[PDB]
Amino acid sequence: CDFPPQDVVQTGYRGLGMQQNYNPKLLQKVIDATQVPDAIPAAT
Amino acid sequence: SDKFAGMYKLWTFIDPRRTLIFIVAFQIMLGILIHMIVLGSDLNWHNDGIPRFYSPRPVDVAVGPAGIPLEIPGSPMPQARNYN
Ligand code: BCL
Numbered sequence: 476c477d478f479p480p481q482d483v484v485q486t487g488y489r490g491l492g493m494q495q496n497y498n499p500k501l502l503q504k505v506i507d508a509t510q511v512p513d514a515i516p517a518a519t
Numbered sequence: 520s521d522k523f524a525g526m527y528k529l530w531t532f533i534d535p536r537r538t539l540i541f542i543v544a545f546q547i548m549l550g551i552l553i554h555m556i557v558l559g560s561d562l563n564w565h566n567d568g569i570p571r572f573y574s575p576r577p578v579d580v581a582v583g584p585a586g587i588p589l590e591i592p593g594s595p596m597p598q599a600r601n602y603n
Pocket residue numbers: 546547549550551553554557562
C-alpha cells in the first residue's frame with residue numbers, strides 16, 4: 476500500500492491521462508542515495 | 520382578423536396544469552442556457568476586466584530549444600507542462 480497523498484506532474488494536454496505520479500515516501504529513498512561528490516580545487 | 524376569436528376554446532382539450540408546469544420549467548432551462556452561452560463568448564461580462572481586473576494575471580514560463588520548460592538541475596521530479 477502507498478497511502479495518500481501523492482505528488483502528480485502534468486505532462487500533456489488536459490483530459491488525456493499523460494502525467495507522472497510520485498509517492499513522497501518512496502522518492503525519499505532515491506533522494507537519500509544520490510550524494511553528489513565534493514569538488515576538487517582547479518589546478519595551477 | 521376576426522379568425523382568432525375562438526382561440527380560448529384551446530383550453531377545453533388542453534389542460535392548464537401540465538401546460539403551466541411545462542412552460543415554467545422550459546423558461547428556467549432556457550434562461551440558464553442562454554446566460555451560459557453568452558458567458559462562453561467574447562461578450563462575457565464577468566471576466567472582461569471592465570471596469571478593472573481584480574485577480575492577479577497569468578505569468579508565462581520560458582521555454583527551451585525543444586519548446587518545453589527547462590529542467591532544474593537538482594530537482595527530484597521533472598517539470599510540469601500542459602500542452603505537449
Ligand atoms: C448581449 C445580450 C444577448 C442576449 C442575452 C440574453 C439572456 C441572458 C437572456 C436572454 C433571454 C431572451 N432573449 Mg436574448 N440576448 C441577445 C440577443 C437576442 C436576440 C437577437 C435577434 O439578437 C433574440 C431574438 C433574443 C431573444 C430572447 C428570448 C428568446 C429570451 C427572452 C425570454 C423569452 O421567453 O422570449 C420570448 C420573447 C420574445 C421572443 C420577444 C423577445 C425578443 C427580444 C426583444 C430580442 C430582440 C432583439 C433584436 C435586436 C430585434 C431586432 C428587430 C428590429 C430591427 C428592432 N435575444 C444578445 C445576444 N437573452 C432570456 C431568456 O431566455 O429567458 C427565459 C435570458 O435569460
